[PDB]
Paper text:
It forms a tightly packed trimer with approximate dimensions of 30×54 Å. GlnK proteins, when activated, are sequestered to the cytoplasmic membrane where they bind directly to their corresponding Amt proteins, physically blocking ammonium uptake by inserting the T-loops deeply into the transporters' substrate channels.
Af-GlnK3 was isolated without the addition of nucleotides during protein purification, resulting in a structure without any bound ligand and T-loops that were disordered in the crystal packing.
Residue numbers in the entry:
A (entry chain B): 1 to 37, 53 to 112
B (entry chain A): 1 to 37, 55 to 112
C (entry chain C): 1 to 38, 55 to 110
């Protein structure tokens, strides 16, 4: 499993949420941040944790929905996640052997 | 080392802090976030040794759970190096 | 690639910002957080760099964020497998 982290223009949040929803990715954590790629501008961090095989689909959904083609569009990082635990059940999601 | 990241109900922060404190885990970073499994949630991050992960995860699950939808999730991410800014001492993951 | 994550005193942000700029590290994400060591207001700074730039980035942050007192914070180095430029769709793979 992987964490897909995108830092986007704040106005793109609804586009990104919709593009992820449409593909079955509803779960997300959103953080208000500041960034730059000269003052720090308001940006929005979107984080989703998905199965390895869903990464490329998630990355492409975010790129398509967050892009303008201008500087300041932001970046997406893919970080490994070793375990994902559902607090309500205690069930842990891992990659088989 | 691992970073244990939990996204919990904001009212559960003190429960989680206490459960971690009781087991010797005092250090933490807390961020105000929004989420859906967008409502206000709290992100708690602790960086621990590999052998402490299961204990930390179970302390958070026990103290943040309600059994209802919206309890949140815990992610375990690898940490390769941890540096103390005050001393410049670096802890490097076993190899 | 790696993500270098530093949790620093809020007053040190400008020092860190400048020390990274001077070395060619302009890209960064900043988050307002609360923290305590092993809750007070702190600042999280995140930079994603090539593997060979990590030690230089860590050095720049340590030098610019330190006071020598307790509460100076910590730096964590986390692996980044893919880095995507949203504007072009170009992906850098580790």
């Amino acid at each position: 499993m992987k964490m897909v982290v995108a830092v986007i223009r704040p106005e793109k949040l609804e586009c990104v949420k919709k593009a992820l929803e449409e593909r079955g990715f509803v779960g997300m954590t959103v953080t208000e941040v500041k960034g730059r790629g000269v003052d720090l501008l308001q940006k929005t961090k979107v984080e989703v944790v998905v199965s390895d095989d869903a990464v490329d689909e998630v990355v492409e959904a975010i790129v398509s929905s967050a892009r303008t083609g201008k500087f300041g569009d932001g970046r997406i990082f893919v970080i490994p996640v070793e375990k994902s635990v559902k607090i309500r059940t205690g069930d842990e999601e891992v990659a088989a052997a």
